[PDB]
Symmetry: C5
Subunit: 92 residues, 5 copies
C-alpha cells in the first residue's frame, strides 16, 4: 500500500491506468490556490462506458471533499475551472 496523487489541470482529461492487479483508492479532491476567488467546479470521471460526476467544489465554501473511491480499471478525471489535486493510495 503506497501513496498516490495527481494534479488535474482545466480541460483535457487525465487518464489514469491501474496496473493489472492494483487498485487506485482516491481519498480526496482539493482545489489548488486561487488569488481571485469568487466559482464552482464540477468533478467528472469516465470509467468504462460510464461518465459520472464525483462532486462539485467551490472556492471559499467547499475547497475540498473527502471520498472513498476505488478504481480497478482505467479512468479519466476532468474539470473546467486552476487545478484540482486528487490524492489517495494504491493497493493490490
Amino acid at each position: 500500500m503506497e501513496f498516490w496523487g495527481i494534479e488535474v489541470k482545466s480541460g483535457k482529461p487525465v487518464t489514469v491506468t491501474p496496473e493489472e492487479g492494483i487498485l487506485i483508492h482516491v481519498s480526496q479532491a482539493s482545489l489548488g490556490e486561487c488569488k481571485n476567488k469568487k466559482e464552482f467546479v464540477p468533478l467528472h470521471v469516465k470509467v468504462g462506458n460510464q461518465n459520472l460526476v464525483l462532486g462539485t467544489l467551490s472556492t471559499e465554501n467547499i475547497p475540498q471533499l473527502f471520498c472513498d473511491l476505488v478504481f480497478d480499471k482505467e479512468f479519466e478525471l476532468s474539470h473546467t475551472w486552476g487545478s484540482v489535486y486528487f490524492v489517495g493510495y494504491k493497493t493490490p
Copy 2:
C-alpha cells in the same frame, strides 16, 4: 472489488439488484450540473428510509458508508440528476 456508479433521474426511481454473493457499497451522492432542497430516498424491503438531503447552494454532495446486500431502490425529486457512486465487493 470494482467501481460502481449510477445516474438517477428526477422522479424516476432506479432499482439496483446485487448479484448473488456481492455487496454494493455506496460511498457518496452528488448533484449533477449551478443557477433547492433534494431529499434522497431508499427502499430496502418495505423500509422507505431517507439517506439525506442535498442542497443546490450549500450541500451539492454528501459522503456515506452504506452497504446493500439485497435489492434496493434509490429515488429523488426536480431539474437534474443525482449520481450515487461506490464499489462492489463480495460477502
Copy 3:
C-alpha cells in the same frame, strides 16, 4: 454483512439489541435537533442536526451491546442507517 436501518420517531425512543451493529449516519426526514443514545449506563449525545444547515451527519459508530436511540424534533423522524456484521 447486511443492510441495517431504523426510523426513530419524535418522543418514541427505539431500543436496538444485537453480531455488531455499525451506524454510518443519521439523517432528518421531511431549528436544532440533538441526537441521544443510551448504552451501558451512559447517556450520550451523538450530535445535533439542523433543518436548514445540517440535515444529516456521517459517523463510524459500533454497537456490540443493546442501545437506545432518541430525539425531540416533534415535526419529523430521524433515520439511522448502517450495516450489521459479525
Copy 4:
C-alpha cells in the same frame, strides 16, 4: 470490538488508559446542549505532546467526525464552561 464513549465536562480533563494490547478508537466529538456563539477547542495530551484535535462551534459546528487511534494513555480536555463534549468510538485489540 466494543462500544466506548466519555462525557468530558468543562475544566475537568479526563484521562483514558487503554489496557496493554487494546486500542481506543475515537470516531467523533460532539457538543452537549447549551442555552451564545462560542468556539470550543478540543485538546489531547499524549506522552510529551499536547495537540489540538479540532474546534467545535455552537451555531455552526456542533460535532466533528474523526479516525483517531490511541495505543497509550491520553487526556482529553476543553474549556467551554457552559457544557460538556462527548467523545465516542470503540475499543479493539492490537
Copy 5:
C-alpha cells in the same frame, strides 16, 4: 498500530520519515488557537508538490482525511499566526 501526531508551526515545514516497516496514516489536520483567513495545506512527496486542502479560521477549523504515506514526505502551511496539527496513527 500506534498514535502519531505533529505540530507544524508557520514557516517551519516538517519532514516526516516513516520508520522501516511502517506506514504513516494521517487522519486529520486542525488549526491551533482574532482574524478571518485561509490556510492552504501542502505536502511534498517524491517529485510531487500537492495541496491537501484549505482550512479557514471562521468556517473550516479542521478537515478529515484518509492519507497513507509509505515514504518520506514534507507537510507545510502558510498561516503565520499559529500552527496546524496533523494527527493519525502508524501501522505496518
